[PDB]
Design an enzyme around this catalytic site. Structure first.
Site, PDB file in Angstrom:
ATOM      1  N   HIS A 264       0.922  -1.289  -0.170  1.00 48.20           N
ATOM      2  CA  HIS A 264      -0.216  -0.154  -0.047  1.00 48.20           C
ATOM      3  C   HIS A 264       0.845   1.242   0.096  1.00 48.20           C
ATOM      4  O   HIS A 264       0.400   2.187  -0.260  1.00 48.20           O
ATOM      5  CB  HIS A 264      -0.946   0.077   1.136  1.00 48.20           C
ATOM      6  CG  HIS A 264      -2.005  -1.150   1.110  1.00 48.20           C
ATOM      7  ND1 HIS A 264      -3.101  -1.338   2.274  1.00 48.20           N
ATOM      8  CD2 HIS A 264      -2.942  -1.399  -0.016  1.00 48.20           C
ATOM      9  CE1 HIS A 264      -3.748  -1.991   1.743  1.00 48.20           C
ATOM     10  NE2 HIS A 264      -3.769  -2.104   0.328  1.00 48.20           N
TER      11      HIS A 264
ATOM     12  N   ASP B 231      -3.439 -10.694  -1.787  1.00 46.84           N
ATOM     13  CA  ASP B 231      -3.899 -10.018  -0.579  1.00 46.84           C
ATOM     14  C   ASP B 231      -5.580  -9.755  -0.864  1.00 46.84           C
ATOM     15  O   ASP B 231      -5.682  -9.395  -2.024  1.00 46.84           O
ATOM     16  CB  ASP B 231      -3.053  -8.864  -0.191  1.00 46.84           C
ATOM     17  CG  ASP B 231      -3.344  -8.482   1.249  1.00 46.84           C
ATOM     18  OD1 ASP B 231      -4.471  -7.475   1.199  1.00 46.84           O
ATOM     19  OD2 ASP B 231      -2.850  -8.669   2.096  1.00 46.84           O
TER      20      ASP B 231
ATOM     21  N   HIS C 262      -6.747  -7.137  -0.307  1.00 51.45           N
ATOM     22  CA  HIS C 262      -6.877  -5.510  -0.448  1.00 51.45           C
ATOM     23  C   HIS C 262      -5.897  -5.202  -1.652  1.00 51.45           C
ATOM     24  O   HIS C 262      -5.058  -6.012  -2.021  1.00 51.45           O
ATOM     25  CB  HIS C 262      -6.300  -4.704   0.544  1.00 51.45           C
ATOM     26  CG  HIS C 262      -7.103  -4.798   1.939  1.00 51.45           C
ATOM     27  ND1 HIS C 262      -6.570  -5.921   3.029  1.00 51.45           N
ATOM     28  CD2 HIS C 262      -8.085  -4.234   2.220  1.00 51.45           C
ATOM     29  CE1 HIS C 262      -7.493  -5.818   3.996  1.00 51.45           C
ATOM     30  NE2 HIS C 262      -8.373  -4.950   3.770  1.00 51.45           N
TER      31      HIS C 262
ATOM     32  N   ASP D 229      -5.066 -12.414   4.276  1.00 54.61           N
ATOM     33  CA  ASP D 229      -6.382 -11.883   4.853  1.00 54.61           C
ATOM     34  C   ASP D 229      -7.633 -12.132   4.026  1.00 54.61           C
ATOM     35  O   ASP D 229      -8.547 -11.546   4.209  1.00 54.61           O
ATOM     36  CB  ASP D 229      -6.179 -10.178   5.108  1.00 54.61           C
ATOM     37  CG  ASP D 229      -5.595  -9.612   3.982  1.00 54.61           C
ATOM     38  OD1 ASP D 229      -5.117 -10.346   3.043  1.00 54.61           O
ATOM     39  OD2 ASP D 229      -5.639  -8.457   3.878  1.00 54.61           O
TER      40      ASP D 229
ATOM     41  N   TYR E  65      -4.621 -11.413   9.549  1.00 56.39           N
ATOM     42  CA  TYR E  65      -4.918 -10.717  10.729  1.00 56.39           C
ATOM     43  C   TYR E  65      -5.390 -12.258  11.786  1.00 56.39           C
ATOM     44  O   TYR E  65      -5.789 -11.481  12.833  1.00 56.39           O
ATOM     45  CB  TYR E  65      -5.502  -9.565  10.873  1.00 56.39           C
ATOM     46  CG  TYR E  65      -4.990  -8.363   9.563  1.00 56.39           C
ATOM     47  CD1 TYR E  65      -3.980  -7.938  10.373  1.00 56.39           C
ATOM     48  CD2 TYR E  65      -5.393  -8.445   8.647  1.00 56.39           C
ATOM     49  CE1 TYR E  65      -3.304  -6.912   9.202  1.00 56.39           C
ATOM     50  CE2 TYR E  65      -5.022  -7.637   7.543  1.00 56.39           C
ATOM     51  CZ  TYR E  65      -3.968  -6.725   8.184  1.00 56.39           C
ATOM     52  OH  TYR E  65      -3.233  -5.719   7.288  1.00 56.39           O
TER      53      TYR E  65
HETATM   54  C1  LIG Z   1      -5.910  -0.739   6.318  1.00 52.58           C
HETATM   55  C2  LIG Z   1      -6.656  -2.274   6.235  1.00 52.58           C
HETATM   56  C3  LIG Z   1      -6.118  -3.420   5.562  1.00 52.58           C
HETATM   57  C4  LIG Z   1      -4.728  -3.457   5.441  1.00 52.58           C
HETATM   58  C5  LIG Z   1      -4.228  -4.481   4.897  1.00 52.58           C
HETATM   59  O1  LIG Z   1      -4.343  -5.659   5.153  1.00 52.58           O
HETATM   60  N1  LIG Z   1      -3.396  -4.451   3.590  1.00 52.58           N
HETATM   61  O2  LIG Z   1      -2.952  -5.266   2.978  1.00 52.58           O
HETATM   62  C6  LIG Z   1      -7.937  -2.218   6.823  1.00 52.58           C
HETATM   63  C7  LIG Z   1      -8.568  -1.185   7.665  1.00 52.58           C
HETATM   64  C8  LIG Z   1      -9.513  -0.443   6.585  1.00 52.58           C
HETATM   65  C9  LIG Z   1      -9.702  -1.902   8.423  1.00 52.58           C
HETATM   66  O3  LIG Z   1     -10.620  -2.570   7.758  1.00 52.58           O
HETATM   67  C10 LIG Z   1      -9.555  -1.952   9.819  1.00 52.58           C
HETATM   68  C11 LIG Z   1     -10.387  -2.664  10.654  1.00 52.58           C
HETATM   69  C12 LIG Z   1     -10.282  -2.429  12.135  1.00 52.58           C
HETATM   70  C13 LIG Z   1      -9.149  -2.010  12.546  1.00 52.58           C
HETATM   71  N2  LIG Z   1      -9.229  -1.800  13.983  1.00 52.58           N
HETATM   72  C14 LIG Z   1      -9.993  -2.829  14.926  1.00 52.58           C
HETATM   73  C15 LIG Z   1      -7.931  -1.100  14.877  1.00 52.58           C
HETATM   74  C16 LIG Z   1      -8.154  -1.293  11.769  1.00 52.58           C
HETATM   75  C17 LIG Z   1      -8.317  -1.095  10.477  1.00 52.58           C
HETATM   76  K   LIG Z   2      -4.505  -8.017  -4.006  1.00 53.17           K
HETATM   77 ZN   LIG Z   3      -4.632  -6.647   3.137  1.00 51.33          ZN
END
Ligand SMILES: CC(/C=C/C(=O)NO)=C\[C@@H](C)C(=O)c1ccc(N(C)C)cc1
Ligand SMILES: [K+]
Ligand SMILES: [Zn+2]
Ligand SMILES: OC[C@H]1O[C@H](O[C@H]2[C@H](O)[C@@H](O)[C@@H](O)O[C@@H]2CO)[C@H](O)[C@@H](O)[C@@H]1O
Ligand SMILES: [K+]
Length: 723
Positions: A501, A539, A541, A632, A672
């Site tokens: 990203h 991924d 995303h 993820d 995650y």
């Molecule tokens: C940035 C991202 C993916 C990254 C990725 O994996 N890039 O490859 C996801 C964000 C939008 C998200 O959905 C989120 C949800 C909960 C949270 N907390 C509970 C702290 C923090 C962020």
């Molecule tokens: K991707």
């Molecule tokens: Zn991701």
């Protein structure tokens, strides 16, 4: 499949002559015999044969057949003693493995010094003469020596001269642990070859096609090739002689002698028909002559027809070289041996690697090619100081490694020691401004870091954040250096923070430095040219940072599959839309498979693999594969809403290993669920280590299939594999 008979044979041979035998067999018994010649078929055949598919009959030199037999891909050959006497006893021994016979011998082929008799009426009997002899010819606008350098088979007769060897042979046994690739004779051999290219005599670009066209157009005095070449040399306006290979250090050249062999696929229901064709239609004076009229087989295994052919001073010259050389081993480790020497020669003869270094790396992998693991526990220092509920935790990489050790997979790998990324490495994808900004955060405190973190989209920063991001990228670059220099075949880089990203001047989505992108650019510098790189971003995303970084670059094919949700899923743009095909000369090199809705699973991703990714990837033909391996999109992940199994990831991984001769690097991104990502990463590492893919399960989603074909439409005008 049960009413036919399909046969594979390499494209340099006389496949058309074999078709004629398949015609005089179809007419006799009614069975249509189709003969095709796929590229890299010594790699292609073990792929299909494992999964039930494949040709009825396989044609190749005997050196590969033991590998096929060790995998149980060949049917046991049972000819009566009568037919056994029809061939020479030493050819049967070449196709004998673990007691059983596993192929029908056809012909003996060894390299020879083919030379122009006009421009050079006297062929040098020593390798040492050639640079001086090239001086006298380079003045007359003509070369002295040109032959294939892209295959180790052609330069091996020189490597084996002063004392180089593959596996040592005593009694009947081959010692897998006794390798003579980095010994004096082998080193002195290649050292002399590289010096030829060092002094502008030979060019490293030279391949089979270039070198043949050079000799055939009468602009090259000498060349090295087998009997199969002679046919093309005849039509050419060139008078040629075939004699012994030049000496090195007063030692005779020792080419690796091979035997053209025919095996029956285990999955063939046509076995009896296979036996009928090879025994009573091919291995006859009539049949072997049909092929030989197209392209010369050399010294055939059949006693009757050999006596006729042995009048040839060229075949006699083929027997001379073959007797001075050694017959190739049939043990299943030959595939790993040839790959090591291929890498060593290409690397050393270019200038990237040195004779000492290249041979040393090959010496370690002649028995088997290793898989590299790179990881540092210090990368756990990067952590959120105001939110413990944040999913990007240091436990991510620990749980992975701890799981790799439980299953004993980590021990079966060659663990690589990481290092921070040099300033130059980071400056290839990131600006000095952004790098300096991030390094400055090292001495900030929790308050100052909070305001600093709000400058970016979904980012947390702590004092360790720079060293960790610098380590993650540098670690992946170390893996690149390893694969590209024959230290390993493939590898995995368990790292954090993620990087796909990260923009050129901005942090985003838990990312700081795009490790995958830097590794890609890094790979091209150590090779010294625009190396073809494939990036698969599976991924959940969209890797907006990676796509933008190579948006106009046609040397880096970027493929990404991700949740789109009509531009609602993070990173929230239309930048991950299927209509986004890159710009300029990089149009068609940005491929976005965009999902609408959750619960995308195994059957969904496998559909995209077979219908889109693999066809495009193979047409692109990458020389290195990098994977944004975020997990993820896995089952049980709290963010992705998808259900890809660990067994699924293993298949996706194993399928991509057919690319770039198996040069893949999985670099961790998202994921995650600690159990889901460590399980998935383990299943992937298994696939990397040559372990066979597990069984699977659940039809493709309709909306997913809609999504898939949607992006092949936009790419169908830029890829012929999609037409
Ligand atoms: C940035 C991202 C993916 C990254 C990725 O994996 N890039 O490859 C996801 C964000 C939008 C998200 O959905 C989120 C949800 C909960 C949270 N907390 C509970 C702290 C923090 C962020
Ligand atoms: K991707
Ligand atoms: Zn991701
Ligand atoms: O270059 C390594 C290669 O060597 C041999 O392949 C030969 C083959 O025997 C010849 O008939 C002809 O096709 O040239 C090939 C090399 O271009 C080994 O048989 C093969 O396993 C190995 O990969
Ligand atoms: K691109």
């Amino acid at each position: 499949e049960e009413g036919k008979l399909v046969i594979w044979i390499n494209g340099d041979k006389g496949y058309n002559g074999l078709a004629e035998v398949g015609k005089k067999f179809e007419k006799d018994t009614g069975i249509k015999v189709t003969v095709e010649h796929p590229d890299k078929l010594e790699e292609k055949f073990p792929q299909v044969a494992a999964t039930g598919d494949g040709p009825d009959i396989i044609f190749w030199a005997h050196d590969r057949f033991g590998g096929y037999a060790q995998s149980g891909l060949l049917a046991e050959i049972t000819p009566d003693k009568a037919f056994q006497d029809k061939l020479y006893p030493f050819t049967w021994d070449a196709v004998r493995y673990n007691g059983k016979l596993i192929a029908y011998p056809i012909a003996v082929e060894a390299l020879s010094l083919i030379y122009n008799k006009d421009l050079l009426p006297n062929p040098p009997k020593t390798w040492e003469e050639i640079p001086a002899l090239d001086k006298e010819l380079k003045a007359k606008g003509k070369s002295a020596l040109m032959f294939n350098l892209q295959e180790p088979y052609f330069t091996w007769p020189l490597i084996a001269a002063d004392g180089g060897y593959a596996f040592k042979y005593e009694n009947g046994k081959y010692d897998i642990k006794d390798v003579g690739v980095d010994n004096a004779g082998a080193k002195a051999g290649l050292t002399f070859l590289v010096d030829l290219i060092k002094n502008k005599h030979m060019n490293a670009d030279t391949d089979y096609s270039i070198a043949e066209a050079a000799f055939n157009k009468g602009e090259t005095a000498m060349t090295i090739n087998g009997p199969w070449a002679w046919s093309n040399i005849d039509t050419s306006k060139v008078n040629y002689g075939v004699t012994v290979l030049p000496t090195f250090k007063g030692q005779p050249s020792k080419p690796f002698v091979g035997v053209l062999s025919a095996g029956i696929n285990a999955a063939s229901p046509n076995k009896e028909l296979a036996k009928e064709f090879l025994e009573n239609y091919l291995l006859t004076d009539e049949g072997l002559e049909a092929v030989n009229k197209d392209k010369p087989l050399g010294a055939v295994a059949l006693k009757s027809y050999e006596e006729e052919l042995a009048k040839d001073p060229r075949i006699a010259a083929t027997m001379e070289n073959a007797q001075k050389g050694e017959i190739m081993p049939n043990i299943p480790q030959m595939s790993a041996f040839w790959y090591a020497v291929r890498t060593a020669v290409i690397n050393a003869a270019s200038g990237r690697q040195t004779v000492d270094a290249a041979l040393a790396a090959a010496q370690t992998n002649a028995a088997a090619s290793r898989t590299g693991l790179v990881y540092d526990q210090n990368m756990m220092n990067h952590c959120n100081l105001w939110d413990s509920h944040h999913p990007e935790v240091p436990q991510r990489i620990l749980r992975i490694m701890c799981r790799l050790e439980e299953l004993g997979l980590a021990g079966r790998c060659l663990t690589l020691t990481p290092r921070p990324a040099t300033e130059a490495e980071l400056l290839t994808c990131h600006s000095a401004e952004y790098v300096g900004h991030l390094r400055a955060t090292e001495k900030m405190k929790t308050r100052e870091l909070h305001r600093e973190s709000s400058n970016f989209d979904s980012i947390y920063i702590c004092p360790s954040t720079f060293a960790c991001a610098q380590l993650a990228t540098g670690a992946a670059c170390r893996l690149v250096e390893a694969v590209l220099s024959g230290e390993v075949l493939n590898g995995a880089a368990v790292v954090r923070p993620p990087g796909h990203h990260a923009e050129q001047d901005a942090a985003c989505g838990f990312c700081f430095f795009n490790s995958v992108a830097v590794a890609a650019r890094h790979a091209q510098t150590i090779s010294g040219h625009a190396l073809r790189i494939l990036i698969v971003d599976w991924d959940v995303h969209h890797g907006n940072g990676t796509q933008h970084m190579f948006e106009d670059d046609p040397s880096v094919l970027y493929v990404s599959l991700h949740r789109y949700d009509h531009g609602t899923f993070f990173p929230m743009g239309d930048e991950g839309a299927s209509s986004q095909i890159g710009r300029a000369a990089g149009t068609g090199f940005t491929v976005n498979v965009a999902w609408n809705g959750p619960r995308m699973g195994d059957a969904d991703y496998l559909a995209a693999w077979h219908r889109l990714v693999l066809p495009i990837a193979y047409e692109f033909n990458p020389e290195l594969v990098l994977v944004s391996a975020g997990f993820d999109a896995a089952r049980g992940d709290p963010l992705g809403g998808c259900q890809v199994s660990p067994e699924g990831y293993a298949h996706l991984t194993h399928l991509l290993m057919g690319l770039a001769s198996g040069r893949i690097i999985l670099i961790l991104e998202g994921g995650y669920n600690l159990t889901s990502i460590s399980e998935s990463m383990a299943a992937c590492t298994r696939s990397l280590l040559g372990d066979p893919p597990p069984l699977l399960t659940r039809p493709p989603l309709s909306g997913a299939l809609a999504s898939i074909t949607e992006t092949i439409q936009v790419h169908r005008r830029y890829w012929r594999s999609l037409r």
